[PDB]
């Protein structure tokens, strides 16, 4: 593994390096200038004035092996140099640490050999036996030079892939003070202190303090950075204090609580009664037994013979007739309950004392009573309860007459007929039904 | 404070530095190489090819003073050097700024003295009078050299504690371009700009923008990064819109709004009546005075003498009896109310007109006729009225009798009896109580 | 554009540079030391031992042009040097890359000219034709030197404003290992990696991981870093599960639901009746027709003639009097209802069968009967329903008497009188009103 470069030069070399007593490098301004350019701690490929690495690869011919190296300079360390201690011209003292050569390539090296169609490692090597002796190693993982050398890079003769790890200086310092620091990759530090500004990858500049995970402790009421809940969605797992909503429960609105669903403490048969005063109370309303109910609130008649169908009621097993009458004082008397030929022929006729009374195809001798003298109605149809008079003030008045009398169903129905010859009769009736059947059961 | 080192070498030195004319250093490749290595701005202990500081402490013997210094190199700046201007061999020109010597130690210095059992400051001193003249100062706070020197470190001969601040280069630059940067302590800048990635101490890599304090502006409704409240705990300091819940208020559920608690606008004695139409309204229900109340809705009898104990009621100060009677049309007569020897002996016997009737231990002639007839009862027990008929259709029918009659408490109680000779009655009674006491209190 | 500096020095220079063979620099320790100080990649103004730029501007005299430069050193790169290949004294080999000179100024340069009242660029130029040949260009945008130079800075003669870009080393390296790093401006990296600590501009130190935007996903229930809502404010956009509040709806509390607002399923006229055992139910309470209502529940009398104004009823059109009586068995007789001369003189006098009775200014003989007899009453005012009896048990007892009788309005009013000759009378009455007008309408 050799390519002895015809024109490469190395500096510095003297009796204390590996060169013969006469074969010391002649001094040059350019050598001193190029040597002073050393900066790193290790061995590295030197940068141009722009800050671009020199000794670059070009014209990789791939499987046909060959590759071009462009001119430039690199620094290669070597240990075990000897020096002259002070004025004593004898080379007498050993250096304790490794120290750099400069390797200067003035020309492009052209079509340097590699192994076919595989990975190869490239090394630049100085032979410390001559002023200038320089060579290159290459091969498919072939052994690096034993002589002072730098791993100029790696080339793959199949893929044309290249990397080079030694292409600029490693530099170890204590404290770096700079204006600007710009890394192509990682800036690692065991503390990163962004005074004035921190910019993240989204390009957002932060000055105020950043937020940690588990900051949720703060968002609650009376924490710093509390949130307003107005307009947020969802249901809280705990039920919440209900807002004013009485009106929502109404008859046909969204909520609907029916009264039959509601509680009461009240005893049986109790009913909510208003006390006035906005408030209800559980009292009781008690209707009577012995119930009576109306059918047709009976018609008026005046200045005329009575319009005597004062009811044509629905079937009730007993009826209670009641009358109010204004009377012809000039010709009072008969209140002829003529009641002619009702649908079934039940009648009886008896007066208030008269024990017996005459009967005919229509009533001859049954009357209600304008003049409170003796008369009555007594039968299955028609039980009476006493008489009335045709005056309040001795001559004439309206405030005269009432009676109460009743009939069973003998006919399933009835309508009651009445006459008066005097004409000047006036009247209102009432009628009410009751309900015990004509047999063993009401 | 002296240890004249036998084998240390210093470079470079001229007539223009502190040496006599004959005592200028002889040039060596090793000297130029080790001088070129300089990189810092100040005076510092040099690093090896690995980037590890040299001239290190070893074998600190503590209170027995002695310490070992390993070989290596350091750079020491000195001002006031004179140089030759151009071609003129005359040392004529003063340098304006301080410039480095290299100090090379080829040997480990062995068991260097310190003061006993205390802190000590160690300095490496160059004497600019010879090619090679070097010494070390040590002592309990003892003064640094006047001569060009570096603070090689501090050792405490009690504790064995050591630090050395000057042990790698302070470096000041304008712009640093790097691949990677790795600081042991702080990275600092007025703008840290993490393109692509920021990694925190937890090892989480961020690309998206980070969060500032007081970000609570966002989490609310209609801000970016809203939160859903579904499932969270607590009670809101404002009461909330209540969800549909009418059914919860029912008779025995968790909510129980009893009716006696509720409002009504209605006037006193008003009651909620249903109107139909799903809706309640404040009506008034008015029961009558003159209240009558039932005890025993009296038994049927048919084809038989009435099984007459039709009341065996609870005490009422007045009872009202009402009858319904179906008939033996072939043989009508009395609905007997002769009764018998009841618990107290009050009866009166008076009829329709007859004014008088006869009496015995069980009654002779108290009758309630199934024929409209001169037949009545009037007494403390038994106030009667009116008489019916034994037919509807002229032969036979059900639709027949009624009467209403009443009795007081004379005895605190009484049942009531009956007979009919012809047997073939059929009968239903009603009985109702009313309540006014026998004296000044109802 | 010239100021040929009389005392500046440049190193190094050989035949391999722009100098004649008579004019090669003499070697000096000071030159070697100052040259080795080079560190950067480009051309720059060298720092002092503190790390402050040298060759600073001073005493800027504005529109009167002149400016002072303080002594120091700067590095100036030059290409196209020639060197000796190895041992051959013939300068023969081209260097491939640019390499530095040192420029040393031992003196301040005084009152250097600029153009008046405008911006000016200052350049320091090495003339590679002599050992020490150095000159300065200045001018209002006047052309930079052709010769190796550095842009020492800019001064504006109008404003006195100054900046200088090249005032410390531009440096390009691969990997930097440092203790501490401090940029006066930006730190930039394609990954910033803070192990241990990150500090923001607010000066808060973070070890735990930071928060990204759109972290709101975590704050919800079941997420890490859940927030508790207790105490927060606003109304949720969804209505919430209502907490127990039955009692809040009550008659005079905040919520108020009046019963007339509520639903019922019940048929018309139905009323919520308590069943007992909590639950309300929609039954119906039915008042009877044939309504009777009280005025003044009548006073007691005993051991005395009746205190007879026993009621004074309001103008109901029909009254129903009811009595209860007790008396001395030594002298029973009439419950006198002869009355007095009433407001209107309506009477009728008819007894049971008697058909007639005498009339006078005050009544002769209208009676109610202690002991069952013919005594009876019938008229416009005064209808009657039979007689009681003078005993309970045979000996003196309370439980003696009742009757019912009624009257119309003949006068719009009335109160009823009474006498009993025995004195030793006792009584209670009832009264009730019923309404039908004395005409054609109730």
């Amino acid at each position: 593994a050799d390519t002895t470069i015809i024109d490469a030069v190395v500096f510095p070399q003297d009796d204390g390096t590996g060169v013969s007593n006469g074969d010391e490098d002649y001094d040059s301004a350019g050598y001193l200038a190029s040597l002073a350019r050393y900066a790193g701690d290790g061995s590295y490929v030197g940068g141009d004035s722009t800050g671009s690495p020199t000794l670059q690869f070009a014209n990789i011919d791939t499987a046909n092996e060959e590759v071009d190296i462009q001119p430039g300079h690199a620094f290669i360390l070597e240990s075990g140099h000897i020096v002259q201690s002070g004025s004593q011209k004898t080379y007498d003292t050993n250096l304790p640490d490794s120290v750099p050569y400069v390797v200067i390539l003035p020309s492009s090296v052209t079509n340097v050999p590699l192994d076919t169609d595989v990975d190869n490692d490239v090394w630049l090597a100085v032979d410390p036996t001559s002023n200038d002796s320089v060579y290159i190693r290459s091969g498919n993982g072939l052994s690096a030079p034993s002589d002072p050398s730098v791993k100029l890079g790696t080339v793959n003769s199949s893929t044309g892939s290249t990397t080079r790890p030694n292409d600029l200086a490693d530099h170890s310092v204590d404290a770096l003070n700079a204006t600007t620091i710009d890394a192509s990759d990682t800036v690692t530090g065991d503390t990163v202190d962004a005074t004035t500004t921190l910019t993240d990858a989204a390009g957002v500049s932060h000055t105020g303090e950043l937020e940690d995970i588990n900051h949720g402790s703060k968002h609650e009421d009376g924490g710093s950075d509390e949130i307003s809940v107005g307009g947020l969605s969802g249901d809280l797992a705990d039920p919440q204090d209900p807002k004013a909503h009485a009106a929502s429960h109404s008859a046909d609105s969204a909520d609907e609580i029916s009264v039959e669903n509601l509680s009461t403490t009240g005893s049986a048969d109790t009913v909510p009664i208003s006390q006035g005063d906005g408030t209800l109370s559980m009292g009781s309303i008690v209707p009577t037994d012995l119930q009576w109910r109306e059918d047709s609130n009976s018609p008026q008649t005046d200045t005329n013979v009575g319009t005597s169908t004062y009811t044509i009621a629905d079937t009730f097993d007993e009826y209670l007739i009641r009358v109010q009458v204004f009377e012809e004082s000039s010709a009072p008397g008969t209140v002829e309950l003529r009641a002619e030929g009702n649908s079934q022929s039940s009648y009886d006729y008896i007066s208030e004392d008269g024990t017996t009374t005459s009967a005919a195809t229509s009533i001859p001798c049954i009357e209600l009573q304008a003049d409170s003298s003796t008369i009555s109605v007594f039968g299955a149809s028609g039980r009476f309860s006493g008489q009335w008079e045709f005056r309040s003030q001795p001559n004439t008045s309206t405030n005269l007459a009432t009676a109460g009398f009743l009939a069973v169903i003998s006919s399933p129905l009835g309508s009651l007929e009445l006459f008066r010859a005097a004409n000047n009769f006036s009247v209102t009736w009432e009628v009410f039904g009751r309900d015990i059947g004509p047999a063993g059961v009401p | 404070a002296d240890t004249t080192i036998i084998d240390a070498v210093v470079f470079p030195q001229d007539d223009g530095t502190g040496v006599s004319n004959g005592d200028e250093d002889y040039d060596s490749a090793g000297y130029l190489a080790s001088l070129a290595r300089y990189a810092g701005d100040g005076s510092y202990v040099g690093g090896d090819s690995t980037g590890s500081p040299t001239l290190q402490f070893a074998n600190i013997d503590t209170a027995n003073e002695e310490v070992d210094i390993q070989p290596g190199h350091a750079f020491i700046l000195e001002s006031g050097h004179i140089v030759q201007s151009g071609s003129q061999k005359t040392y004529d020109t003063n340098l304006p700024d301080s410039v480095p010597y290299v100090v090379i130690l080829p040997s480990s210095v062995t068991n260097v003295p310190l003061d006993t059992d205390v802190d000590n400051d160690v300095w490496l001193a160059v004497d600019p009078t010879s090619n090679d003249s070097v010494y070390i100062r040590s002592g309990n706070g003892l003064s640094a050299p006047s001569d060009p020197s570096v603070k090689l470190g501090t050792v405490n001969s009690s504790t064995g504690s050591t630090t050395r601040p000057n042990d790698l280069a302070d470096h000041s630059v304008d712009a640093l371009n790097a691949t990677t940067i790795d600081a042991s302590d702080t990275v600092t800048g007025d703008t840290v700009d993490a393109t692509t990635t920021l990694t925190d101490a937890a090892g989480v890599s961020h690309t998206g923008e980070l969060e500032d304090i007081n970000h609570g502006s966002k989490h609310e409704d209609g801000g970016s990064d809203e939160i859903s409240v579904g499932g969270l705990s607590g009670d809101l300091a404002d009461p909330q819109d209540p969800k549909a819940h009418a059914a919860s208020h029912s008779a025995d559920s968790a909510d129980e709004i009893s009716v006696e608690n509720l409002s009504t606008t209605g006037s006193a004695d008003t009651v909620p009546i249903s109107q139909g139409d799903g809706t309640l309204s404040m009506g008034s229900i008015v029961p009558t005075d003159l209240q009558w109340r039932e005890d025993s809705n009296s038994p049927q009898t048919d084809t038989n003498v009435g099984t007459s104990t039709y009341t065996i009621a609870d005490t009422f100060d007045e009872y009202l009896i009402r009858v319904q009677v179906f008939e033996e049309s072939s043989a009508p007569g009395t609905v007997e109310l002769r009764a018998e020897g009841n618990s107290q002996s009050s009866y009166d016997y008076i009829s329709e007109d007859g004014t008088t009737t006869s009496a015995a231990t069980s009654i002779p002639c108290i009758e309630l006729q199934a024929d409209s007839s001169t037949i009545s009862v009037f007494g403390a027990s038994g106030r009667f009225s009116g008489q019916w008929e034994f037919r509807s259709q002229p032969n036979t029918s059900t639709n027949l009798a009624t009467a209403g009659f009443l009795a007081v408490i004379s005895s605190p109680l009484g049942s009531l009896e009956l007979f009919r000779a012809a047997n073939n009655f059929s009968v239903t009674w009603e009985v109702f109580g009313r309540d006014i006491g026998p004296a000044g209190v109802p | 554009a010239d100021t040929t500096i009389i005392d500046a020095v440049v190193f190094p220079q050989d035949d391999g540079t722009g100098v004649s063979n008579g004019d090669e620099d003499y070697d000096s320790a000071g030159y070697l030391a100052s040259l080795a100080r080079y560190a950067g990649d480009g051309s720059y103004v060298g720092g002092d031992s503190t790390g402050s730029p040298t060759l600073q501007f001073a005493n800027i005299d504005t529109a009167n042009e002149e400016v002072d430069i303080q002594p120091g050193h700067a590095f100036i790169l030059e290409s196209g040097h020639i060197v000796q290949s190895g041992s051959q004294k013939t300068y023969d080999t081209n260097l491939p890359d640019s390499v530095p000179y040192v420029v040393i100024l031992p003196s301040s340069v005084t009152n250097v000219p600029l153009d008046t009242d405008v911006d000016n660029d200052v350049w320091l130029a090495v003339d590679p034709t002599s050992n020490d040949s150095v000159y300065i260009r200045s001018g209002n945008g006047l052309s930079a030197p052709s010769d190796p130079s550095v842009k020492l800075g800019t001064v504006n003669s109008s404003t006195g404003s100054t900046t200088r870009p090249n005032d410390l080393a531009d440096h390009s390296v691969d990997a930097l290992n440092a203790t501490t790093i401090d940029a006066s401006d930006t730190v930039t990296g394609d990954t910033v990696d803070a192990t241990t600590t990150l500090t923001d501009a607010a000066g808060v130190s973070h070890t735990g991981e930071l928060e990204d935007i759109n972290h709101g996903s975590k704050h919800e229930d079941g997420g890490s870093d859940e927030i508790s809502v207790g105490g927060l404010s606003g109304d949720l956009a969804d209505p919430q599960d209502p907490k127990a509040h039955a009692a809040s709806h009550s008659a005079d509390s905040a919520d108020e639901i009046s019963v007339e607002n509520l639903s019922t399923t019940g048929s018309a006229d139905t009323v919520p009746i308590s069943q007992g055992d909590g639950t309300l139910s929609m039954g119906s309470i039915v008042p009877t027709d044939l309504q009777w209502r009280e005025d003044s529940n009548s006073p007691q009398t005993d051991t005395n003639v009746g205190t007879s104004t026993y009621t004074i009823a309001d103008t109901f059109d029909e009254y129903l009097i009811r009595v209860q009586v007790f008396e001395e068995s030594s002298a029973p007789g009439t419950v006198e209802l002869r009355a007095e001369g009433n407001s209107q003189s309506s009477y009728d006098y008819i007894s049971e069968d008697g058909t007639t009775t005498s009339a006078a200014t005050s009544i002769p003989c209208i009676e109610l009967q202690a002991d069952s007899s013919t005594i009876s009453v019938f008229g416009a005012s005064g209808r009657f329903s039979g007689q009681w009896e003078f005993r309970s048990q045979p000996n003196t007892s309370t439980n003696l008497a009742t009757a019912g009788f009624l009257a119309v309005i003949s006068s719009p009013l009335g109160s009823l009188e009474l006498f009993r000759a025995a004195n030793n009378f006792s009584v209670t009455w009832e009264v009730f009103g019923r309404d039908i007008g004395p005409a054609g309408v109730p």
Binding site: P12, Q13, D14, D15, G16, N21, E24, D25, Y26, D27, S28, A29, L32, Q84, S87, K89, T90, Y91 | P12, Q13, D14, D15, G16, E24, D25, Y26, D27, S28, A29, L32, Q84, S87, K89, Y91 | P12, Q13, D14, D15, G16, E24, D25, Y26, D27, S28, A29, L32, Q84, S87, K89, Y91
Partner: peptide, 16 residues
């Protein structure tokens, strides 16, 4: 040679 006792570039570094 020694420093100072040669003009640069006109001598090799060290010694015979």
């Amino acid at each position: 040679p020694q420093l100072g006792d040669s003009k640069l570039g006109e001598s090799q570094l060290g010694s015979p």
